[PDB]
Amino acid sequence: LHGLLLDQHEEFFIKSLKQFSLRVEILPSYIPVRVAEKILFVGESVQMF
């Protein structure tokens, strides 16, 4: 909702335009890739505007 993170030096399967990249390898298998793409898109979108 705010594009903010406090996580330093641990994984959360995500790392104006950019500053987020998809950690595809670490991702939980029981949570699909498809929703994580939407999540990455939303976080980037909120950071942009």
Add this chain to the structure above:
Amino acid sequence: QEALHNCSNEHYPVLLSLLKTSCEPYTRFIHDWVYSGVFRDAYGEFMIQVKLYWTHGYVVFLKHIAHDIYVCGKTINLLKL
């Protein structure tokens, strides 16, 4: 900074209550200098301090608002002159 460094702890609401009263004086400092333009000096522990006459020495919380207050007080300080 201990707050942003934390995200979840058994002392996380405890530290929230600690900082919430540990920031009680500074909000009062800012509530002085904006509506009066004169802050009661303690020891110079206010983060800002003090012809065209402006030569104020200025050059953590958001410094995005620090310069905003730094200009918001010096203009009222000119009206006192």
Add this chain to the structure above:
Amino acid sequence: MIHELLLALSGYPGSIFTWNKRSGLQVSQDFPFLHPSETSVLNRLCRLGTDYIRFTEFIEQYTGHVQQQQGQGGLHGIYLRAFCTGLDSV
């Protein structure tokens, strides 16, 4: 036997149930005052306190040891700490 067993099982090693890190809790098993009938039931009870001491040691070692943390998930990170909290609550 009465208080000593509960003291061992809570995770305070005594002089009857001697803590090692290679054999955990262990009966002294060198007295002819205790016999093979009670010995076995006691060893079965020793297992639980051994595992318990391991659990509490890991939880204490890695939760509440730093402010909140570069990085290795098996030693650091929020997720390991939240694991130790869940393990303590179970």
Add this chain to the structure above:
Amino acid sequence: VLMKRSITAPLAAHISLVNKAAVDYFFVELHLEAH
């Protein structure tokens, strides 16, 4: 979450009102625009 949404919000809106009154005070009273 760590943020200010009840402290800076009734404060920053007042800062701008002070600033606009001062910018007004220069022009319509001391006539800098005529200089």
